[PDB]
Amino acid sequence: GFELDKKLGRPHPFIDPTKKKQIETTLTSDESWWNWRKPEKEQWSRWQRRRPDVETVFLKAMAETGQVKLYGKEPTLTETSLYRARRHLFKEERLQAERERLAKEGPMAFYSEWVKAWKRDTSREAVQKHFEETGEDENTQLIEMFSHQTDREYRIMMGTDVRIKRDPLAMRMKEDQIKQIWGGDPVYPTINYIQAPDAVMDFRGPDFHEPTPNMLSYLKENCKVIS
Amino acid sequence: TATSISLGIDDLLTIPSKGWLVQDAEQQSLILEKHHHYGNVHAVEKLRQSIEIWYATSEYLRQEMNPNFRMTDPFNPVHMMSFSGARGNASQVHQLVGMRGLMSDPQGQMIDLPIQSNLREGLSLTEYIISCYGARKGVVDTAVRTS
């Protein structure tokens, strides 16, 4: 168990649970000076919430696939720091698994993830069977499948470009996971900021001062200049 | 060019323990301010504690900044610019990812309001006004220095 996971670098607690002890009893605010006593009521802080970040979101996603194991349900600041140092290793593992999956299923099954309109069986045996009964080899069938792909799907599929190599975990994250990178919706609604690009400013709106009178017409109106 | 170093919001990395340290300094200030109101400490003691607790907190963040980069993000773009000696020093980087610290008013003294935030987080309005003392003085000294 432990001391073998530790030796190999497999996921394990930093401190052995068997060789872990409590911290006894400490001063209980009656044996303490005033400056070291805990406040009776919790104090508002503005730092009372953990700062959202990319590392927290990726670690949770990797914990659900089993690629890593964490001490608890939510990654600690220690675990996000450690992830920052070794994050390129875990991404390389995921990219390698996609390469092996493509080499197993073949291009038809692999790339049908981004061609929703394609309903023919995409297995290797089905591809071979279609070739024998019709004469169309695998490359011909692949070109036919990509003829049913939308431009929106094609742009998503560019994550599999051999020069881009987008993280497979990033490519399949759902919206509710992704938005926790910045911590969800802003409390001040963005609709307050949004303006139509072709809007014409209405100078009689509630945020504008009253129209400026012509100075001469103002002086004549108040009977200080005679025509 | 081929590597194409850049700079994003995510690259402006704050050390993991800033939230713990700022919250601890806030707690000690809050307790002392209460006992100042009770008459248990006098106004000079409150003044010293406010300046010294936040200066030490800021200096500790700056000290821990480089080892955090060296250990957890060695190829961080902000770290590579200053650490290699290409552009920028730790002090300027500390303003981006650490905390701006304490400013001084024109007549020598310090302002009794620490700037807890940095430029990535965004200063509050009161913090921004205080930081204008440093900007105004900084150009005045440089004009005097070259003359």
Partner: peptide, 29 residues
Amino acid sequence: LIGLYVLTSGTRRGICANRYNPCEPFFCN
């Protein structure tokens, strides 16, 4: 200076190079 630094920053080492504890090409010139 940044270009030289990136150029001569060598390979990743240790726990930054291998996920697990391990218990490369050769060029003639």
